[PDB]
Amino acid sequence: KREPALNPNEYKKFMLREKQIINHNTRLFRFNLHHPEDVVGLPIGQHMSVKATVDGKEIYRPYTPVSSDDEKGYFDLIIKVYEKGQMSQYIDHLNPGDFLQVRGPKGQFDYKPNMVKEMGMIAGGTGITPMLQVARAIIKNPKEKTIINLIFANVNEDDILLRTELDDMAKKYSNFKVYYVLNNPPAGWTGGVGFVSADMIKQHFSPPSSDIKVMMCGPPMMNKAMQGHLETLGYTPEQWFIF
Amino acid sequence: KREPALNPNEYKKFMLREKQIINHNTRLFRFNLHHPEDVVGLPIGQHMSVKATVDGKEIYRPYTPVSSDDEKGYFDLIIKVYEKGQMSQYIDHLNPGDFLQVRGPKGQFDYKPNMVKEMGMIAGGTGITPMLQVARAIIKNPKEKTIINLIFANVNEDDILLRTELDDMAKKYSNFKVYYVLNNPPAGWTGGVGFVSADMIKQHFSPPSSDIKVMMCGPPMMNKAMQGHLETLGYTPEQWFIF
Numbered sequence: 001k002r003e004p005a006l007n008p009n010e011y012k013k014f015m016l017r018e019k020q021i022i023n024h025n026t027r028l029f030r031f032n033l034h035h036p037e038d039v040v041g042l043p044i045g046q047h048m049s050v051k052a053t054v055d056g057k058e059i060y061r062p063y064t065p066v067s068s069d070d071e072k073g074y075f076d077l078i079i080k081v082y083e084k085g086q087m088s089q090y091i092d093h094l095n096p097g098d099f100l101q102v103r104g105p106k107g108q109f110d111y112k113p114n115m116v117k118e119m120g121m122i123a124g125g126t127g128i129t130p131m132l133q134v135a136r137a138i139i140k141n142p143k144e145k146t147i148i149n150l151i152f153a154n155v156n157e158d159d160i161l162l163r164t165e166l167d168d169m170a171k172k173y174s175n176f177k178v179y180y181v182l183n184n185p186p187a188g189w190t191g192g193v194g195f196v197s198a199d200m201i202k203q204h205f206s207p208p209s210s211d212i213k214v215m216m217c218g219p220p221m222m223n224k225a226m227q228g229h230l231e232t233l234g235y236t237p238e239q240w241f242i243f
Numbered sequence: 244k245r246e247p248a249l250n251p252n253e254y255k256k257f258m259l260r261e262k263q264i265i266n267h268n269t270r271l272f273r274f275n276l277h278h279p280e281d282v283v284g285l286p287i288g289q290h291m292s293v294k295a296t297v298d299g300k301e302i303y304r305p306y307t308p309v310s311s312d313d314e315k316g317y318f319d320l321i322i323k324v325y326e327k328g329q330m331s332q333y334i335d336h337l338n339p340g341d342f343l344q345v346r347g348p349k350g351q352f353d354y355k356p357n358m359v360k361e362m363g364m365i366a367g368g369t370g371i372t373p374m375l376q377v378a379r380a381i382i383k384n385p386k387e388k389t390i391i392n393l394i395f396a397n398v399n400e401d402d403i404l405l406r407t408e409l410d411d412m413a414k415k416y417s418n419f420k421v422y423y424v425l426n427n428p429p430a431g432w433t434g435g436v437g438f439v440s441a442d443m444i445k446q447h448f449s450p451p452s453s454d455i456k457v458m459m460c461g462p463p464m465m466n467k468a469m470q471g472h473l474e475t476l477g478y479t480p481e482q483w484f485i486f
């Protein structure tokens with residue numbers, strides 16, 4: 001009878017199995033777990049913490065796998081690679097057979113079924129991975145009554161990760177809806193245009209007087225601005241959570 | 244006997260006296276206090292909160308005046324204007340004679356002389372204003388033995404706000420030192436080059452084993468990266484503060 005895959009105090013090494021190109025700046029990285037029957041086992045709303053040595057110093061970043069909670073023997077990371085981003089460049093230089101050091105689960109989010117009537121999720125870019133993990137857990141549980149509205153914001157149409165997956169979840173589940181926003185939309189776009197606005201949020205989420213938890217993840221200036229909008233709209237800090 | 248200039252619970256109106264261009268995207272704005280013998284009255288480490296109405300909705304942002312604590316009958320804000328920055332745009336469209344609504348003081352900082360042996364400050368852009376307010380207070384206190392090391396990072400040489408004032412402080416006070424960092428340095432530059440690195444911080448601040456507080460203010464991606472460095476170098480969360 002085996003240990004859980006991750007330990008919250010001690011880093012373990014996990015080997016890169018394979019990688020593939022998603023778009024110009026994004027790749028999918030598949031790592032082996034230590035046993036074919038292991039699963040990652042992240043609690044809802046929690047993440048992996050990864051460490052690497054770069055120029056003789058250790059660097060640390062959080063990641064949320066996009067493989068579903070129940071996938072056996074491996075986990076998948078979708079990683080956007082930044083021009084001067086130390087860890088995404090480190091991971092994008094690993095070859096099959098190389099290792100990544102990982103501990104967890106980490107994170108202060110504390111999920112209980114039906115903890116709120118409504119979740120408003122705001123995601124930019126790879127901010128979708130923590131949202132996808134929470135949403136999946138909610139919609140696949142048939143006792144959950146939580147309504148989920150996602151505002152998913154990117155620059156260009158080709159930046160919209162997991163569009164097919166999200167579109168399928170929304171077709172299949174009454175309680176999950178997605179609103180897409182693009183700084184540079186194509187002609188005939190039916191979604192949001194520009195940055196996420198206070199109007200877009202007021203139109204799509206229940207107001208402060210309802211039982212709502214708003215969750216955000218994206219680049220730090222997007223998180224900063226969402227918090228400004230939630231202040232504008234009258235939500236209190238107890239009603240939101242930034243990953 | 245007059246009331247304090249700011250009230251922490253209620254906004255009051257303060258008139259724009261005049262404005263001046265500092266560089267291509269930065270202006271200095273001078274606001275009248277209600278009586279010529281008033282001072283703005285912000286305790287060390289605290290800020291004012293400004294509100295405005297943009298497209299029917301209230302927005303709110305913090306600012307720290309750059310006028311010294313004892314200036315009578317006005318306060319000065321140096322403000323960088325961003326292309327899609329709602330508040331900085333609002334403020335840059337005010338004419339002399341228009342009002343700005345302000346409340347205060349706001350913030351957690353609680354000055355005690357010699358609360359730490361060393362302060363490491365990291366500022367980017369207008370993140371210098373809260374740092375300047377704290378450093379001015381420390382260096383003018385005879386009892387203070389706190390060593391202050393400031394890393395001040397900007398993109399171009401013309402973006403280094405308050406250089407004259409910072410350098411005069413460093414020459415007068417041996418406990419105050421500044422290291423300037425530029426992404427785009429001029430020919431002959433002897434300061435830091437690029438983004439602020441873990442090594443720049445290690446070379447200028449005392450190690451985690453020391454009695455140190457690190458204070459950061461800057462654009463949100465700079466603050467997120469600085470926190471990455473402080474984790475790399477072994478500082479714990481109780482040893483740092485983001486304004």
Ligand SMILES: Cc1cc2nc3c(=O)[nH]c(=O)nc-3n(C[C@H](O)[C@H](O)[C@H](O)COP(=O)(O)OP(=O)(O)OC[C@H]3O[C@@H](n4cnc5c(N)ncnc54)[C@H](O)[C@@H]3O)c2cc1C
Nearest residue numbers: 061062063064079080082084085086087088126129438468
């Ligand atoms: C819960 C959670 C889950 C996440 N899940 C994923 C995921 O599944 N997939 C994914 O790709 N990401 C995910 N992220 C993001 C991840 O943690 C990292 O932030 C991301 O991988 C980029 O890290 P980096 O080291 O490559 O670049 P960063 O260090 O974050 O650099 C990014 C950019 O910032 C600027 N920059 C770099 N250094 C500095 C500096 N010294 N000063 C100022 N600016 C600087 C540069 O322009 C650089 O290109 C998640 C985050 C959280 C919180």
Ligand SMILES: Cc1cc2nc3c(=O)[nH]c(=O)nc-3n(C[C@H](O)[C@H](O)[C@H](O)COP(=O)(O)OP(=O)(O)OC[C@H]3O[C@@H](n4cnc5c(N)ncnc54)[C@H](O)[C@@H]3O)c2cc1C
Nearest residue numbers: 195222225305306307322323325327328329330331369372
């Ligand atoms: C203690 C403290 C003191 C400060 N003192 C000063 C000071 O003296 N002077 C000063 O100038 N500033 C100061 N600041 C910062 C100030 O509070 C504001 O952050 C700043 O004025 C910019 O606000 P803004 O509304 O103009 O732009 P922001 O709303 O912050 O927009 C800035 C940029 O972010 C991007 N952006 C805008 N909206 C969104 C969105 N919806 N999603 C994603 N990205 C978006 C755009 O590129 C925009 O140009 C201080 C901050 C603190 C915490």
Ligand code: NA
Nearest residue numbers: 219220221464
């Ligand atoms: Na950003």
Ligand code: NA
Nearest residue numbers: 221462463464
């Ligand atoms: Na930024």
